[PDB]
Design a protein around this ligand. Structure first.
Ligand SMILES: Nc1ncnc2c1ncn2[C@@H]1OC(COP(=O)(O)OP(=O)(O)O)=C(OP(=O)(O)OP(=O)(O)O)C1=O
Ligand SMILES: [Mg+2]
Lengths: 69, 600, 1340
């Protein structure tokens, strides 16, 4: 179901938006989890270009410089 | 921070942080006093409690704040403050709002912005553009100029305003069309002027609704607003490739009035060289807007390899549809206006213009359809009086007849022939039928009873009565609603869900009485509640829906697959509840499709 | 017919004669408060009752007691007018006589001493004004009456949903007026349970044990005993022949030498016939029958003394032997029967973990106060306190009535607390209901909903005030010495006064008065609410309670409820409705004895109505009052159908009595869809009163009753003739019959003049009688806002034409002739109170001086020497109202600014400009200045100018009163002195003051002259006191808040015309925002040349189905017709007989109306004054459901020489060419709703920002920014608007650094943003990081 499928998000910043913020933060802090941003919801929360539309050209130029030299 | 009157305010954390420190310091003392373990254990337990109420108050006994009954907002609650608490919204600079009103003079890509709002909104642009030209020595005086509202700042405001779109937003922002970018038109007064065709997208009435404005500051946002969010760049709904910029009501009445014909009118039968002389015949009082009339018209069709082939003929039309042809652009068939042009046919007219001629000729089309629609609708003098709601002469007859049948179904129940559950069920059916009978009795009379005469005896046609044209065209009004005015208005439902076995025999052109109105009430109030709640449920759906989507973006060009779903028309039991052409249009085929025969 | 009737008579249609007339519409609010504050020398609710409840207060057995004697209300510190200007509350102090007694130590109650502390002061309780409002902080507030669930017992279902098996459960809930809730409820297993309050569930037998009932007695309580004899040998059973109904035999049931039933045949009536009539009391049974039976009492082994079988345990076949051989002859068992008498309490005792009283008391205490250990001393006292202590529990009489009534008892009155029988009888009903006999009640029947109001709710708040002073009274009496302390050192007033203050101030039942409008007022005071304390909250209750219920007929309005979050959670009182004796809702009816309809009226509560058969209001009866028709439509037991003539018991009183005041003002309502009517009665109250009051040509009749009953007008105390009519005041020389013997006098009404309402509107009265005019009791001496000649005129009627107009009325918009804005008719006047506060900062005090830094000499021109603008000066936005300057030292300046200081040599100020300046955009005239200076600061220059003027002005008022009031007394001395000793010319030569000496012969006139001298010298002396007081109020040091030193309030009279954006609507739910203001030339005009005022779109009529608005526009057209017809005969000056011919024709019109009119109106002055008031159109009354019919409407149009179709041919004033088809034209009453655009319009480039979240906050100057929420963010995401989004939530809001790198870049001419990180997220770093969580930002 859509709400069960939405529950599974990699970016914990996205999940700390709509899910219960305590559990997401705790369960992620024990894993030492890395949020890579990449997604929409979180890139808004942190105030930068959306990885879509006009910003899609920006993230595509960024995801490639990453994991490269 | 201090307030006025010298009173202080502080975040609740300070009560929480203070307590942890005090109990920690007291514990540090209780060790140098070498206290009995019975005390230091109790102190340790309190330090544990004090820290817990600081980090997340609520997971123990919930400490209360100083002298105030309310609990204290812990660090955990600094983050929430219950669900979806970091994304509730943020107030924004360079913005405003006011009540919105019409403005039908507008081109599609513009909107009326008050002299005052546009002044305050673009203030930093004016300040710069003022001393960029040298009308102000420096910014400090520039402020004093636009504060003084010198006559020249107004002429400067037009300069900053021109190629600078603004954003408009109406209350429940449902789809992306709820924010659209327009080019600003400096207007006097405090109202926002909204193009009437973009009303449909926004769901904006003019019964007190307000819209908000936003200034694209950066160069990108101005180009984003111009190329993505512009009024004229979003003329089709993204839910179904059909136009969201349909003529709404006032205008479709106008075109339906134009593209109409009556049996014997001024001009009946003359032949006119072109559409131009057809408008000349009408504005001079010689020819009637609706009179059967042959006119020489030229139509175009791009059947060549991208080229407009012309064809000229004596088409069999009316005077009104002749004048409307002067608006239709280039490669469309004269058949598109030859009919009666209701809101139904008037939108598919607009759609074909986009799919045939392209974006720009469609935008300038929709404008002319509204301008002419408004004008001839206003020329029409269409009104609505009390005598326009024609009750059938056979109404009281139908009532007594169903009033008779029920008296017999009752007669059978008394004698034990039929059951109480059957009676209530069987009585509802004859009343349900009687309402259907009165309904399509008034619509038979209302629709055509205009009996007129051409050179001979008689002949009847679709009526020209005000309230009929409103429905037949599709501007405003619906046969379900009309039925409540002339014919009887339905069976009502009593609160628990039953439908009441004696319906409302009376209608709105007559009066309702105490009992009928009182019963009409529950439907109305549960109507306002149901429509109030189903506005909530929807909004919680689009949340759950963007929460599962959001991150989904058209990333790759072509994934490269032959996998795809087999598309058919839905064909629900009877016949095609949805054609194939609709379900498959705009999609890309998985593999080659073949004729009834193959190799092909 | 009367006087304000001789002026202007509304022609009323409708057949049904009004048998009952509208009551005083504000009775609810005034009658309720009357009982709260009133010496009631009995137990009835009041301040007395709240006192007697907690008094006397004794000490902890200390034989030291404090008792209550009496209470008094002082006169208020300020008058209602002063309380609004100053900012205080209109309240009276509460002085309460107390008595302190101290009994002798260890002696039979005799007092050592008693100190009767004269009237200890405990708080000021606010007072209710003549019209039912309260002033709380210079703000008029109304306390809405509340609808809560009635106190008593209430049995509910909870059918279906519980446990998904169906079955349905059954709960009984004992709901008191105060104290804990006691709930009894079943469960899936038919086990009984109880929960106090809403606490944990407990087996329902525990509360019986706590009442000291043994297991044996409880069984004895709820079950009949089945006697089993062991006679001769081996098992018999005493048999009731009725017991076998619903069961089948298990053996050969033979007795009396005739076998009635053999083994296996169900016992039917034939078998119960035989057993009963043959009188078989005893039979024989097998030893196997008692294999499951439950033993009732205890049994022990006689010799050994050991327990054989406990009470409430199932006997077995060997257990029977184990006590049969132990010498037991009888055995008691239960009568258990799953269909008839269910074995619930038997099986419940087996789930009960307790066994005795003390054991049960403990489990109760530990359920109530869990975690902590119980004591015998605590468990007994807590349980006694929950439902049995006269202090912590009370049903009220309303509760004990509904309680005893629902248990089928006879008493309507009894204990305020619960007894053993009360609790048991409720269990006996809830069990009986599950057993199949009985029905549940329903929450929503208005006989189980109950109506509080201000007076009752205030009493409850003052009650809670006493209880917290009771804690403190006993606290001090614990230690007190003898003759030292007194009932004063104990009682603290601040806790009592702030408690009662919080109620009237901030309650979900106390609200603002958002706009003046005599409907808003009158509809708010009649409002009901189920919200707040004692009631439900919006989210807790579903749609069942919000829905319209058959009980609402004639008690609550079905139409006038708000749309939104609390639909149906509000309602408004039905017109003729009344609050029951006990506080239910009753509605009027007419008693039908046999076949005659009487006029004896009976008010029927909700529960009362159910049995009777009530006829419909539209019922044709004539002659003896027989129903004309053989059978009439009636409603009786919950529903309506045709009924037999001679069977009805009652008939509706009025065709209206279902609707509210708001609904009852919609003409042709019966023609309006119930959806658009609700909106209609909602927008009607929102009408801001217009500059000139019109009056509705299209009316319903209630226009007077609404206008008169709300105090916005000025109604005649007593009848007489006008002595003097100013625009200020009105003097009525009282008629002798209505005049009181002594004092004589004249009733003098001082009219309200241009003064501020509850923001920002105005309230101003105008005299509507001319000099030397006869008035009678109950006439209107002065209209108020939105009243004309005593009729509710919330707007003005407009000549309006339905047609599309080039899309300038596109959606629901409105297109208006410039003639409307020229004629100033929809102009509206607003008075804003703008304050200026000189405070005390730690840097120093603030001045009000007219020396302001960095402003031109022309800026200060409007200011006076003291710094305050002059009265009468017209100002616009930005102008300085009060020049105020605050200390800011050590400026800490920049290098460059200091270089600027040395070049142009300006003494850099230690002071900052903080003047009160006129808000930008608004403009008006200054019409008042007030200055309140903290006591001790010397009253400044202008402040003393005001003190002198206010002082001298009030001296004129008080003395003008005396001057007119001495004449009215001395004038009747003249009439009494002349009677029996007439000196016509001889008397008025000697000085008038010298008249008191003249006596008279033996007569009561010597006692009357004595009467006037008495009340004269008090009028002499009551002036002197009333003058001193007004002086002391002006010159006293006005008490301010902390830190504030003086305040200057400037009052601005803003006159706001009408402009594009203003919301307007008629009475039929037809909203609309005026869209273009158009020239008179472009206006569609008729063949006569007369333009139209408003062009309405016809499309807003069919879909959004308000058909009544059209009959309004037609009957409004015929109304104007008769007006212009009179206007012809009046400018032609025919004669009274030509006028009376036509006027008499119009007042008859149609057939069978209830009107009746003249020929008797005296041939000259009367007929002419009437015709003049009609020339503008003849006002008409369409009753709400007794309305005008199409014929009577078409027939009024004929009389006026107007077309029946109500449509005419119109011409476009632009091209001059005619309009095809006939458009409708006519007169529609149209309102202006206070959503005026120059209020709704806001903009903001850059403004202020909040400290904690660097986000746009909006104080002074450029206001707050627009909120850009989650849904608006999705819009930009659905577009590509990546940048538009980033700047929207970075530079344009939370980015403290980029926002100014933007503003600098904008003015520089570079449209770039240099983003950065929002503060919301930067704070979340520190918030997460200041938990135990390390959150970082990685990589590069
Ligand atoms: N984005 C928007 N689009 C259209 N209308 C809006 C928008 N935002 C606010 N309104 C209207 O502005 C107030 C409420 O504003 P806010 O919610 O309190 O927020 P903020 O104080 O920060 O302004 C209401 O209008 P009204 O007060 O006249 O009453 P209404 O809701 O029935 O229309 C709103 O419709
Ligand atoms: Mg609207």
């Amino acid at each position: 179901g859509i709400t069960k499928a939405s529950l599974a998000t990699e970016s914990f910043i996205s999940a700390a938006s709509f899910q219960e913020t305590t559990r997401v933060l705790t369960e992620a802090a024990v894993a030492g989890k890395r949020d890579e941003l990449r997604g929409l919801k979180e890139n808004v929360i942190v105030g930068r270009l959306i990885p879509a539309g006009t910003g899609y050209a920006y993230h595509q130029d960024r995801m490639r410089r990453r994991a490269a030299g | 921070v201090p307030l006025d009157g010298g009173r202080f305010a502080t975040s609740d954390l300070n009560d929480l942080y203070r307590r942890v420190i005090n109990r920690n310091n007291r514990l540090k003392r209780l060790l140098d006093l070498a206290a009995p373990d019975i005390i230091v254990r109790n102190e340790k337990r309190m330090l544990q409690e004090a820290v817990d109420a600081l980090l997340d108050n609520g997971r123990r006994g919930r400490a209360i704040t100083g002298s105030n009954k309310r609990p204290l907002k812990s660090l955990a609650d600094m983050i929430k403050g219950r669900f979806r608490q970091n994304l509730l919204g943020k107030r924004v600079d360079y913005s405003g709002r006011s009540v919105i009103t019409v403005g039908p003079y507008l081109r599609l890509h513009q909107c009326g912005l008050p002299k005052k709002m546009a002044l305050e909104l673009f203030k930093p642009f004016i300040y710069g553009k003022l001393e960029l030209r040298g009308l102000a020595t420096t910014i400090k005086a520039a402020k004093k100029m636009v504060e003084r509202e010198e006559a020249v700042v107004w002429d400067i405001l037009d300069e900053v305003i021109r190629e600078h779109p603004v954003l408009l937003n109406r209350a429940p922002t449902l789809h992306r069309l709820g924010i659209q970018a327009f080019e600003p038109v400096l207007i006097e007064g405090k109202a926002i002027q909204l193009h009437p065709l973009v009303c449909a997208a926004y769901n904006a009435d003019f019964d007190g609704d307000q819209m908000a404005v936003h200034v694209p500051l950066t160069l990108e946002a101005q180009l984003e607003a111009r190329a993505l969010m512009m009024s004229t760049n979003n003329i089709l709904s993204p839910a179904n490739g059909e136009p969201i910029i349909v003529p709404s009501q006032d205008v479709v009445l106008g075109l339906y009035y134009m593209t109409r014909d009556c049996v014997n009118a001024k001009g009946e039968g003359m032949v006119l060289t072109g559409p131009k002389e057809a408008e000349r015949l009408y504005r001079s009082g010689l020819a009637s807007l609706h009179a059967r009339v042959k006119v020489r018209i030229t139509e175009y069709e791009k059947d060549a390899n991208g080229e407009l082939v012309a064809k000229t003929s004596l088409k069999d039309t009316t005077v009104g549809r002749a004048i409307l042809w002067m608006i239709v652009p280039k490669g469309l068939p004269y058949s598109i206006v030859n009919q009666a042009l209701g809101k139904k046919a008037i939108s598919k007219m607009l759609n074909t213009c986009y799919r045939i001629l392209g974006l720009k000729p469609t935008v300038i089309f929709a404008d002319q359809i509204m301008y002419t629609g408004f004008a001839y609708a206003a020329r029409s003098g269409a009104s609505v009086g009390i005598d326009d709601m024609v009750i059938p002469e056979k109404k009281h007859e139908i009532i007594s007849e169903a009033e008779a049948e029920v008296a017999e179904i009752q007669e059978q129940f008394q004698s034990g022939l039929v059951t109480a559950g059957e009676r209530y069920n069987k009585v509802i059916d004859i009343w349900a039928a009687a309402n259907d009978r009165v309904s399509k009795a008034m619509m038979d009379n209302l629709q055509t009873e205009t009996v007129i005469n051409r050179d001979g005896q008689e002949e009847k046609q679709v009526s020209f009565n005000s309230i009929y044209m409103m429905a037949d065209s599709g501007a405003r009004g619906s046969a379900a609603q009309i039925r409540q005015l002339a014919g009887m208005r339905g069976l009502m439902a009593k609160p628990d869900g039953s439908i009441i076995e004696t319906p409302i025999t009376a209608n709105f052109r007559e009066g309702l009485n105490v009992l009928q109105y009182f019963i009409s009430t529950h439907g109305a109030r549960k109507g306002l509640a149901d429509t109030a709640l189903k506005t909530a449920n929807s909004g919680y759906l689009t949340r759950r829906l963007v929460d599962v989507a959001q991150d989904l973006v058209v990333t790759e060009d072509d994934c490269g697959t032959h996998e795809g779903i087999m598309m058919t028309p839905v064909i629900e039991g009877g016949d095609v509840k949805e054609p194939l052409r609709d379900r498959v249009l705009g999609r890309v085929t998985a593999e080659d499709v073949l004729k009834p025969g193959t190799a092909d | 017919y009367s006087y304000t009737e001789k002026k202007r008579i509304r022609k009323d249609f409708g057949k049904r004669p009004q048998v009952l007339d509208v009551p005083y519409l504000l009775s609810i609010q005034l009658d309720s408060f009357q009982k709260f504050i009133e010496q009631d020398p009995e137990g009835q609710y009041g301040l007395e009752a709240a006192f007697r409840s907690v008094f006397p207060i004794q000490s902890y057995s200390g034989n030291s007691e404090l008792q209550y004697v009496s209470y008094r209300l002082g006169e208020p510190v300020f008058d209602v007018q002063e309380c609004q200007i100053r900012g205080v509350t209109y309240s009276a102090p509460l002085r309460v006589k107390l008595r302190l007694v101290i009994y002798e130590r260890e002696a039979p109650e005799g007092t050592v001493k008693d100190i009767k502390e004269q009237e200890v002061y405990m708080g000021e309780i606010p007072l209710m004004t003549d019209n039912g409002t309260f002033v709380i902080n210079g703000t008029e507030r109304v306390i809405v009456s509340q609808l809560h669930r009635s106190p008593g017992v209430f049995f509910d279902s909870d059918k279906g949903k519980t446990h998904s098996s169906g079955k349905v459960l059954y709960n009984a809930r004992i709901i008191p007026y105060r104290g804990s809730w006691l709930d009894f409820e079943f469960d899936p297993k038919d086990n009984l349970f109880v929960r106090i309050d809403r606490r944990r569930k407990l087996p329902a037998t525990i509360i019986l044990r706590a009442l000291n009932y043994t297991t044996e007695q409880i069984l004895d309580l709820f079950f009949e005993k089945v006697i089993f004899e062991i006679r001769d040998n081996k098992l018999q059973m005493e048999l009731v022949p009725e017991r076998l109904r619903g069961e089948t035999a298990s053996f050969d049931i033979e007795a009396n030498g005739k076998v009635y039933v053999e083994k296996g045949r169900r016992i039917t009536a034939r078998h119960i016939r035989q057993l009963e009539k043959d009188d078989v009391k005893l039979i024989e049974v097998p030893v196997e029958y008692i294999a499951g039976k439950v033993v009732a009492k205890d049994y022990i082994d006689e010799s050994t003394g050991e327990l054989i079988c406990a009470a409430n345990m199932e006997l077995s076949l060997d257990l029977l032997a184990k006590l049969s051989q132990s010498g037991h002859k009888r055995i008691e068992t239960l009568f258990t029967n799953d269909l008839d008498h269910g074995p619930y309490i038997s099986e419940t005792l087996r789930v009960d973990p307790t066994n005795d009283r003390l054991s049960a008391l403990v489990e109760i205490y530990r359920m109530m106060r869990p975690g902590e250990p119980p004591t015998r001393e605590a468990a007994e006292s807590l349980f006694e306190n929950l439902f049995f202590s006269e202090d912590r529990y009370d049903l009220s009489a309303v509760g004990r009535m509904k309680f005893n009534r629902s248990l089928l008892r006879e008493e309507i009155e009894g204990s305020g607390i619960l007894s053993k029988d009360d609790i048991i009888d409720v269990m006996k009903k809830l069990i009986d209901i599950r057993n199949g006999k009985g029905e549940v009640d329903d929450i929503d029947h208005l006989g189980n909903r109950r109506i509080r109001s201000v007076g009752e709710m205030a009493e409850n708040q003052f009650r809670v005030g006493l209880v917290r002073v009771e804690r403190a009274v006993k606290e001090r009496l614990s230690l007190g010495d003898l003759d030292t302390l007194m009932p004063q050192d104990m009682i603290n007033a601040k806790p009592i006064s702030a408690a009662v203050k919080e109620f009237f101030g901030s309650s979900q039942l106390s609200q603002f008065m958002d706009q003046n409008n005599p409907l808003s007022e009158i509809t708010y005071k009649r409002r009901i609410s189920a919200l707040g304390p004692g009631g439900l909250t919006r989210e807790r209750a579903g749609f069942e309670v919000r829905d319209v219920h058959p009980t609402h007929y004639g008690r609550v309005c079905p139409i006038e409820t708000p749309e939104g979050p609390n639909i149906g959670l509000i309602n408004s009182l039905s017109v003729y409705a009344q609050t029951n004796e006990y506080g239910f809702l009753e509605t009027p009816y007419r008693k039908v004895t046999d076949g005659v309809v009487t006029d004896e009226i009976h008010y029927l509560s909700a529960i009362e109505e159910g049995n009777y058969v009530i006829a419909q209001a539209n019922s044709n009866l004539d002659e003896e009052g027989h129903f004309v028709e053989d059978l009439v439509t009636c409603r009786s037991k919950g529903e309506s159908s045709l009924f037999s003539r001679d069977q009805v018991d009652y008939m509706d009183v009025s065709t209206q009595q279902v609707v509210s005041v708001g609904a009852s003002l919609i003409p042709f309502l019966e023609h309006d869809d119930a959806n658009r009517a609700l909106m209609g009665a909602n927008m009607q109250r929102q009408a801001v009163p217009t500059l000139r009051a019109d009056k509705p040509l299209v009316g319903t009749g209630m226009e007077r009753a609404v206008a008169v009953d709300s105090g916005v007008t000025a109604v005649a105390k007593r009848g007489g003739v006008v002595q003097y009519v100013d625009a200020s005041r009105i003097v009525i020389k009282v008629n002798e019959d209505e005049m009181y013997p002594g004092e004589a006098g004249i009733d003098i009404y001082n009219l309200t003049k241009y003064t501020r309402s509850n923001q920002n509107t105005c309230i101003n009265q105008m005299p509507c009688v001319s000099l030397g005019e006869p008035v009678e009791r109950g006439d209107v001496l002065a209209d108020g806002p939105s009243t004309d000649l005593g009729e509710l005129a919330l707007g003005q009627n407009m000549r309006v034409a339905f047609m599309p107009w080039n899309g300038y009325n596109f959606e629901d918009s409105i297109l208006v002739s410039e003639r409307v804005v020229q004629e100033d008719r929809f102009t509206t006047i607003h008075i804003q109170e703008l304050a200026c506060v000189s405070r005390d900062t730690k840097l120093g005090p603030e001045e009000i001086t007219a020396d302001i830094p960095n402003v031109g000499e022309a800026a200060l021109s409007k200011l006076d020497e003291s710094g305050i603008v002059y009265i009468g000066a017209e100002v616009t936005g930005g102008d300085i109202l009060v020049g105020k300057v605050t200390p800011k030292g050590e400026t800490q300046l920049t290098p460059e600014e200091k270089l600027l200081r040395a070049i142009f040599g300006e003494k850099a100020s230690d002071v900052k400009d903080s003047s009160l300046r006129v808000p930008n955009g608004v403009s008006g005239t200054v019409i008042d200045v007030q200055v309140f200076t903290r006591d001790g600061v010397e009253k400044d220059k202008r402040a003393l100018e005001i003190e002198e003027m206010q002082l001298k002005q009030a001296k004129k008022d008080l003395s003008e009163e005396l001057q007119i009031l001495e004449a009215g007394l001395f004038s009747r001395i003249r009439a009494v002195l002349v009677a029996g000793g007439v000196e016509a010319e001889k008397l008025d030569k000697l000085p008038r003051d010298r008249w008191l000496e003249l006596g008279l012969t033996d007569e009561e006139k010597q006692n009357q002259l004595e009467q006037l001298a008495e009340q004269y010298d008090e009028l002499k002396h009551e002036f002197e006191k009333k003058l001193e007081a007004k002086r002391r109020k002006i010159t006293q040091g006005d008490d301010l808040a902390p830190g504030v030193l003086k305040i200057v309030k400037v009052y601005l009279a803003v006159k706001r015309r009408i402009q594009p954006g203003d919301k307007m609507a008629g009475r039929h739910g037809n909203k609309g925002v005026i869209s273009k203001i158009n020239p008179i030339e472009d206006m569609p005009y008729d063949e006569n040349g007369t333009p139209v005022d408003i062009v309405l779109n016809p499309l807003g009529v069919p879909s959004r189905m308000n058909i009544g608005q059209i009959l309004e526009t037609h009957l409004g057209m015929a109304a104007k017709g008769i007006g212009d017809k009179i206007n012809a005969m009046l400018k032609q000056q025919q004669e009274v007989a030509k006028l009376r011919e036509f006027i008499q024709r119009a007042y008859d019109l149609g057939a069978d109306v209830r009107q009746k009119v003249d020929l008797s109106t005296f041939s000259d002055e009367e007929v002419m004054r009437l015709a003049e008031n009609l020339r503008k159109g003849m006002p008409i009354a369409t009753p709400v459901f007794d309305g005008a019919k199409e014929a009577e409407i078409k027939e009024l149009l004929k009389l006026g020489d107007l077309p029946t179709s109500g449509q005419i041919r119109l011409y476009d004033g632009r091209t001059g060419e005619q309009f095809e088809r006939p458009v409708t034209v006519g007169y529609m009453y149209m309102l202006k709703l206070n959503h005026l655009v120059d209020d709704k319009m806001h903009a903001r480039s850059t403004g202020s920002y909040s400290l904690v979240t660097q986000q746009p906050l909006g104080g002074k100057a450029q206001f707050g920014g627009q909120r850009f929420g989650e849904m608006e963010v999705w819009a930009l995401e659905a577009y590509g608007a990546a940048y538009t989004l980033q700047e929207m939530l970075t530079v344009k809001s939370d980015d403290v650094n980029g926002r100014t790198k933007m503003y600098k870049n904008i003015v520089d001419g570079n449209h770039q943003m240099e983003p950065g990180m929002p503060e919301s997220f930067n704070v979340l770093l520190k918030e997460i990081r200041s938990l135990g969580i390390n959150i970082e930002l990685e990589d590069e």
